[model samples]
Target: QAARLRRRQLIRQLLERDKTPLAILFMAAVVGTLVGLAAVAFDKGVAWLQNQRMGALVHTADNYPLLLTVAFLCSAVLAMFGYFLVRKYAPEAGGSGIPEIEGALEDQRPVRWWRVLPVKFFGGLGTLGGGMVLGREGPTVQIGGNIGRMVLDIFRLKGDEARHTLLATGAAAGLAAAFNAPLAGILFIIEEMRPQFRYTLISIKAVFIGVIMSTIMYRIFNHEVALIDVGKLSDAPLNTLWLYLILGIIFGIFGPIFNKWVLGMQDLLHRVHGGNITKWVLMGGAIGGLCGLLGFVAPATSGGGFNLIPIATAGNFSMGMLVFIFVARVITTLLCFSSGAPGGIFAPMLALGTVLGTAFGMVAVELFPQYHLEAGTFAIAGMGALLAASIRAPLTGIILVLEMTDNYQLILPMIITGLGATLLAQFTGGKPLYSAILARTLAKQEAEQL
Candidate 1:
């Protein structure tokens, strides 16, 4: 008992010193806990809204005209709420908010939690709930950073390390909670927020704490599971390795083209809307209505595209159908994301990778039945290629796909594909998507300042 007392006393002596170590980790836990709940809330909230919207549409299933009209109008109104709220309350809350988080990390942007949390929370619901092809991770990420700031302010902590550390913790926590992948959560900040590496010792511990807590929260609410399930598959044969490289090159070429189209569409929409909130909202409504009609007609082409991943990877759709859906979704993804909606492009982009990858695998399978390849292998390998090219996040994307899909068999091919894409993307002179967006926003901010 005396020895135990002495050990316990020593523990107390260590913690009784200052608020730095003791409080920093405690605050990290707090941030992670809050961000986890916030993420789950946003996720479930969007799903609930989606279910409610679909349930209402189902009620009118007997009447084709009524169903069509209801679908269009209902989706339009949901998206109207999203666009209007973003335009009216927080202009910065629009689009995949990952760039905003990146800007904040660069110290080039402010974290207005009060304005952003509400706007992004509800606005994202409206847009995503209405069948837009945006990912949940973007909003969760920005929200996470804002939450970090919120916690820092509440504690009255002041300093460069304090602010940056807490914000990174929450951003990592948010991404971790969003997808339930702790490693990607860490790598995201290390890779995506590639400014200066200030995280070495204690600060990184706080991030680790934050990720652990958020992942725990994620598992508690949702049963522990892989985000995507493509089933156990065979490995890529030695001969088929070349085919993976060819697949990566395809994504590498498409990556720059897709990014250009996204940026161009953004510019075109801005011109069309002319910076008018009313017109922007109207445009959003039209786009949302079209998505609703399309979703009702061709369900695979709309929404966040997660539901389509497994189906495509399993080769449920023929090559032609897969190609058609990929083309259709590309159009849908561009329109929804480029319209300044409060959602993300990552999930849609990942789906695009899977669709294209699986399609390519099918072709390879037809040509080289001797190779005995599984299309799912290409699906897994190609999934992260576009992300590597467009976002310059090969590590995080590859890890993310690895975590989401489960396994180490495809890691070599995945790495090869990722490297090929990133190298080719760099050779093609395409900027990373979020960084490019952040740069454009900064330019606008500077211009406005002038």
Candidate 2:
């Protein structure tokens, strides 16, 4: 027994000493490939499911009541499945797992991969598959983070190598899966997760490998395509660029207000529920049910707002209707997220930015017809601004949207919007939404300990 223990100790020491740069490089390749494949597969799965539902609905368009009933029932069943799995197996998987990842990186929380991996993956599939008002990115990232933990534990890694490097890799992989953008995945780790993400040769390489692997896995399951297919919007004239900045400033103000409301709603919900799991679940059901009802009438105002983005950008709605839908979606977004539902507000927030940007663009076009701004351009530029302003991660926000839209040419505009939003938000003392949430969770945990 002593010899065995000594050998184990020696092995650990050797492993700790062998933090070679080359090993990290290899890990990066592995992580990137895994992340790329995961992302691609997840995207294909969503599209396939979406197509399946819509195709079936098209066949029964003649039966309006039946179609609506089926849609609602299907979505409700899926959402309940997701919520139940999360609550039963891993409550950490609830909401955006980004905060959990942040918590883990800070060592203020734990990463139970065995539970979170399966829970986040299948549970996310159920919710996102249901067409609920959730973003695949949150679940995908959480799953990826758990996968990183799994890899570390399986290999018996220890110390910072096991904890920090793998955590960043999984996060990058998660973003990669959500967007099919490998570079964005890397940047997300380097930029967005910077506060807790420890950058090193091993860590960065691990992130690269995770992204590459996920992308490869994604392609093997489902090929790549532009997420929103807006089709090469015209470049903003230097003259019209100022309008984008103004929209950014507007988002700066709105982003903080939105964040404040989100926190306030959560506080209200907490007080009302008082830590009762039954009440929490009931609140989730009510939110989901109400979303279903709203979807029946004005589908645009409910859900994750992905579909609304294209339609709004495509000029389907009048300016007044755009404003109306924007307000309506705000209420829906707040209700759906603040209800403690097993979902995310990331995509919904992005959708909000698109709405406000387009509304402002329309008003600007009326005022300055000479610049001839396309509302879609604002839609695209503003896509990442709320994310930047609210999350305070301008680099990740810029890259995430660029990859999702496949509009690399608009990189300048994306940066401008993100920077302007970030600047104004910072000046107004707006904290990052996810960071704030994590801080609150930690504070509550500390208070409980006391």
Candidate 3:
């Protein structure tokens, strides 16, 4: 009876404290609406731009030389345009902008939304438009967050909570807009940005409100189809789940090594280029051109791994080819990502996880035919596991996949996979990838200032 009374009292307090200002909620709605529109526009714009370029190849399909030249020219020009924008305006806007937002939140970095917002948005359009193996989600999130800052500055909002909540709202809205996944957006902040996020009832509700608005806006602008349609696979037996654990362990090793390699490669590339603008742009062009050519020659070998994921999860590729593509993409992902291009590593990493996971699943099936395994299921499990292991954000990873795929039935396996991956990664001394990247960026800036 006493415990029940205490619970009631707590509930009462929560209800009383939950009355956030109507004006703040109204602003959040506007922010969400804007972010959702931006996200929908960005997604459609990229697809339109991509197809528009490919349309040029229709006339030259029979003429091999012309096809190659035109494809190269189209991609090279698009990529160079993106590269030039980032290099000229805000070099910091290159790559995933999540880390930049995190830096801004800590006051350790500047939020030059005036510059970064446009540079990342249109610049991202160009790079992603070129069909490079990149994800739009990260750039979209960054853009959304910048929009929040812009809103705050415009309204002359002061105080920490106001600034922080708006920024978080914009980020959540951004992710929701990008994927039409509201739950995932809220989970991302609660999990990935836990250190920075203020965990008050009011704050949590604010995030939810932002995500809801963003999601509604996204649905209004876009079709309701799941982003990556993987026909549902039956549940993994309790016995076979151990294999999924093994896959997670493997990724735990690979994720950190991959992150380390990314930063190392970036440092080495900077040394070689010595911050020379011409070399930077040319190198970017070369990478972008090569990625473009890869798309033309073998479509599976490139692009943001979202589409390729379904094909891989369907168990179409042979083990050898799966490994081959996995290794090839890893190299490209590291190279293109580390070089600071105006693209994102998120989707590329997802592709890597799918390839590697499928390979592992195929091998496991071969060894234990009695299990009658569907390697495709493992592909889905691996999708979230890699992100969990690499970023140490199991909740975000799981929720993101759930929201994107709408495989609510697979939630248990997703949790198991995410937990197993995150545990192994932490036990094995692997730091969260984005956190490490932000730290390096901060260290560099501090040294420069010193």
Candidate 4:
């Protein structure tokens, strides 16, 4: 009888119209585990799709025309399906969807989990599988945020603070699970979402617990390995530290230009699309098919650029080759990302940075052979420089690379590059990429409502 009363009392407390830290933490753990599982499934699904489509080409090596045609058709169909889903169901799931989550955090947007979860999941599979220059992290983060709202709705959690806490927790866990970098995930919320995030002791604790659970869940499926396996490169010397700052400034210039190109391409595609579902889907198919063809011509410039990072860091490509691939990928990245595809630009940007960084490093080596420097050092520093400049989240960019690379010795250079990139980009009057994207999204929403 005593135990029964105690259980009833606890249930009453939970059901009360007040914010409960313990209950929020429990929900965060649930979100973490679920998002982690979804992340693993997403990875395997994309890999399987790639193998099924690309594997045929290997066996039919003698028939080049047939191979190319099959590749194009397969990718085109997959991409069309993705575009169709987003257009017909959850249009907000288009693009990175990060801005949507940011909007939701501030209660400026609605979370349609019922639509977003399914659309982003299967749509991402189609788009990502189609070999578009996109990443999975963005979709995962959006899905995670949706899931948080879903849980809140289901449990009838009415407190504003509780809703906000769980939303941030879910986003953090999603990022941690997506990249297998828990610390980076936690820091992302604290730094990037600081303005919107309600920083209370309970909320921070929930974030920590959620990231811990999600990261553990990820590790259980995927063994501990550096997300980008560049091997351990040599460290940067105090003398050569100035080079990283220079590299950052160079990226600072590149960042705003990149932003402009993205917005321009987005407008171009929108003009062509004219909000017509058939035209939009067809355009996606065309772009997907083109990427398929490019895969045959220049494999390095295709896909999310994850696989290209290690090779670029190994210094296998000539400086000329690096520059060529860099330019080629820049064009592809702009096209694919701005098309409103269901993918993220994070990994692709990282890859572009690596290519340019390696190219810069090679040039530096030639210019200053007296330092006996390795091109890979610049590759490490440049890894997060573009992210810093574009996202304007230097701390998240810095910690993310450190977590992904596990190179504590390179911290100074990374910091130098990250800070320099952000400062210069800001000085150049460049707004953060996601924030700009969010503003555009809100404007569109307001216009539609009006």
**Number of colliding residue pairs in model 4:** 0
Q: Per-prediction TM-score, please? A: 0.93, 0.87, 0.93, 0.93
The models' CA-based lDDT, in order, is 0.84, 0.73, 0.77, 0.82
Is candidate 2 or 4 superior in TM-score? Answer: 4
Best by lDDT: 1
Rate residue 310 of model 1 by lDDT. Answer: 53
lDDT comparing candidate 1 with the true structure: 0.84
- Per residue, candidate 1 scores C-alpha lDDT tens digits across 1-450 of 977899888799887843356677789888899888899888888889789888988777898999988888888999999999899999998988888877787687798998999899889889988887888887888888888889998887766767777888899998899889899998888888646445422277788889889889889888856667777789876787888888888888888889999987898889888989899999999999888888789888887887656555555678888888899999989999999999888888888888888888888888999988778788878887878888878999999889888858888898888888888788888888988898888898999986
Residue pairs in collision within model 1: none
Worst 10 residues of 4 by lDDT: 193-202
Model 2 per-residue lDDT tens digits across residues 166-230: 77788887777676777887887776664544444336655666787777776666544445767
Give the higher-lDDT candidate: 1 or 4: 1
- Please give the lDDT score at residue 10 for candidate 2: 82
> In angstroms, how far off is 191's CA in candidate 3?
0.8
